[PDB]
Enzyme design. Sequence first.
Site, PDB file in Angstrom:
ATOM      1  N   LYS C 122       0.856  -1.171   0.000  1.00  0.00           N
ATOM      2  CA  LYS C 122       0.000   0.000   0.000  1.00  0.00           C
ATOM      3  C   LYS C 122       0.895   1.225   0.000  1.00  0.00           C
ATOM      4  O   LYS C 122       1.916   1.263   0.695  1.00  0.00           O
ATOM      5  CB  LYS C 122      -0.916   0.006   1.221  1.00  0.00           C
ATOM      6  N   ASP C 213     -16.186   3.424  12.428  1.00  0.00           N
ATOM      7  CA  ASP C 213     -16.540   3.773  11.046  1.00  0.00           C
ATOM      8  C   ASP C 213     -16.928   2.537  10.239  1.00  0.00           C
ATOM      9  O   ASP C 213     -16.091   1.861   9.638  1.00  0.00           O
ATOM     10  CB  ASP C 213     -15.379   4.519  10.395  1.00  0.00           C
TER      11      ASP C 213
END
EC number: 2.7.11.1
Lengths: 135, 45, 286, 127, 112, 63
Positions: C122, C213
Amino acid sequence: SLVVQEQGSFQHILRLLNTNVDGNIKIVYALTTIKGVGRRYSNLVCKKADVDLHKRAGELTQEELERIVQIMQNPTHYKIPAWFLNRQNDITDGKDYHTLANNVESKLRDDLERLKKIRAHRGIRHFWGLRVRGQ
Amino acid sequence: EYDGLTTARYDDHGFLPGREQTSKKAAVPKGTSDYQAKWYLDDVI
Amino acid sequence: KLDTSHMRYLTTDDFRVLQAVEQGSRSHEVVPTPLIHQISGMRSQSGTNRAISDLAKLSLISKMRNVKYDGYRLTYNGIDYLALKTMLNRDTVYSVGNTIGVGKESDIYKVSDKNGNPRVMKIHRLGRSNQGANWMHLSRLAANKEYQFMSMLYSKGFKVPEPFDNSRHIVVMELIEGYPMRRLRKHKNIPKLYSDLMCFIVDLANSGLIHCDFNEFNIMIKDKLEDENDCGFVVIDFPQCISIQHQDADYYFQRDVDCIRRFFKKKLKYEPKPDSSMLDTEGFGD
Amino acid sequence: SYRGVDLEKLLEMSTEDFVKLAPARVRRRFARGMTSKPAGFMKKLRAAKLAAPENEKPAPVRTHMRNMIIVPEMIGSVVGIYNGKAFNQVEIRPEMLGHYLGEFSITYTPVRHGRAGATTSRFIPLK
Amino acid sequence: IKHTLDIINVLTDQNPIQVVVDAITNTGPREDTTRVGGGGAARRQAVDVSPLRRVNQAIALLTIGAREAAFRNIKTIAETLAEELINAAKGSSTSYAIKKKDELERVAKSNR
Amino acid sequence: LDQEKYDRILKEVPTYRYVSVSVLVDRLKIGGSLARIALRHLEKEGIIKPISKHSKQAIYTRA
RNA sequence: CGCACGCGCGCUACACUGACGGAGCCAGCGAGUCUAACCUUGGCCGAGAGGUCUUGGUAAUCUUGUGAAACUCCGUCGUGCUGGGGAUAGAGCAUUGUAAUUAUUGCUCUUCAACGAGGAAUUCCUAGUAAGCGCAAGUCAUCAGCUUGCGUUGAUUACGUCCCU
């Protein structure tokens, strides 16, 4: 309107013409709940029976349908529409199939059985669409 | 060993080796260009 | 946008240079001209401006000709190519690319390891890119800080993936063949996993960091085992993490009671069975 | 086999008549004008059945279009047909009815969505 | 309003403003927080906006409450307004707009 | 069960505050297309006053 | 112009101020054949499409009052992944283009899809600006979706500075 009720008569779901032509949708769109019959087939019956789309419809009588059996039961003399149907004056057979739930998909795919056994487009790749796209 | 490899002695910062895993399938119908052979009768088993 | 194809023309002339100048641009931002040789101990004129004119087009360095404070800067590829070069140097990346995946400051770049099993490079680039005074300072350290804050429940018995290296923007996360809750169709044990959403924030209060979240992309039923489908949990729920001292937990604690009530009921019209739990237990049982 | 109706009626038809019962996107093709490009094809067809070991296999005579329509009359001859380069051998039968000779084409080394091995040849090995 | 309001002209209204004498105004706003900066903790302060919020808790929630809360409604658009100005005087708290009526005098009171 | 609606309208139009199709849903019998049909024959009883007419929006008023 | 993925663009559908059968029938930036195949105004050919079996035009006249659209009123259906959508595709039809193939869009009718204003971030806004809705055009042999316009009808919220930048 009429403040009158009845004695156990009206249902809510039927079982009509070998599948569920229901008792909450009419002749017209419960023959769309089963695949193969559109709008103006039973809406040309409106100029002969005056039954349009405006009701909750657990109300139909099986003797009004017998003057529609005068429109249904023989598919060769009884006012079959000719710019209307699903498949119609086909490459498959040649007649205007305004058929029913058990008789649309068996009369639908002789254009997909064909073309690339014949080396062109729809005789291996649609069988590949059945040997791969079907499982 | 000269033919039992996948990559030359370039390890020692370079290649990830490109593996060519040969899994051939037949070409039944007649007439073939550069292209259409591998998409003839793919019995994907 | 992105360039990748300006790297493979070099030699050893830049390999001694890099982390001497990367620890040298941090000790001494924009570097003037005759220092690339002398930070690394490279010689003065044995293949030198040949190699710097080689580096010049490649956008990992640029000729910032200012007035006697010249610039040789290790554009945006001074982090990007040179962290690819750093993972070539720190023994993880052996070539570039089998990569599919898009974010903003997290692109999923699908790689194969030194081992052979896959993982994911990433990459962190926020502001898109906008790489400046703090944006480089963030993606250097948010690659380092989030190398430190992806182990908060892995030690404590629960499922957080593990980070591997933190080279300049790059965070390497095995690779996870996930199935998020928008991709899935059916489930075999429904009523266990609604009450385990009260109970995951129960687990999050043990470590002292409450996470919230939850959208429809979050909970990956992943592939640990491929054949028998021993799945697992990947919980992409992290960045709503709040220190509980701050005065916003009046509406974080009440989220744990009456906010998750839609998804196992509606997505999975099937009105649910089970009980639930609060977090009043977790205030004391840390 | 052409419709199910009598076979001694249908096989030698030109670009004229039944399509005036058929809809106008394939009536503004076949009921306007015969397009006699398969008329000298018969003159090369009438020699492409003579000197064969008969009824079995004639020669692959080449044909290089994508909008040309073959008529079924010619049971027992072979023509090679455009597939982008080469000429697919067709023992010509009544087993193709009004569809393109140049429909014999899916022209690619196949689309790599299940085995992506030629995508691996474009990526970056890197010094 | 003209296709709907004769139902409201039945319930104790000779002209339709007579129950509505004491109905529109009596949601008089007295108190609302600001978003405090806080430095971290986004707390709330006991302060006062101009009196156009419990107004708009009763009037702008009639803008939605006539069109956009009747948008995709079980019944029609203009004829779910057979209820919208009957007992809108003071806090009922059992409705689409009155449910957050106490929450201007307590949200700026709870953490103040 | 034949005319229970006949007595529980003529004794309940001065008990129901309005006259609509949602009165009938309290007994949970029909929700459907027998409703826009019934707006032009209902008020031959003569207790609730009609007001306005529109073909796209046929609205009357309770009394 | 073929599709493992991903983005944006506009256009929609997720409904009862919805569209449907017909009456109430308006604009303009208006544009139309020379040494010819244009704009089109007669009934019908036609299930439908227009050919211009005809006509009017070097032009605010003949189209033209572009009898434009969203549309207003007698009848249609009270919440049912629905009389919402034509999504995908087939069969009965053209104006062409020397042929509609990877169909070029004009034409009758069934197939009726995801999607319950939709996680992150936001696009422009003050006396004529949001907001729809048309007209015709380079797109036209097949239309405008982009576009430049004009025309039709035209809402909550407002004179303020850096918090974003």
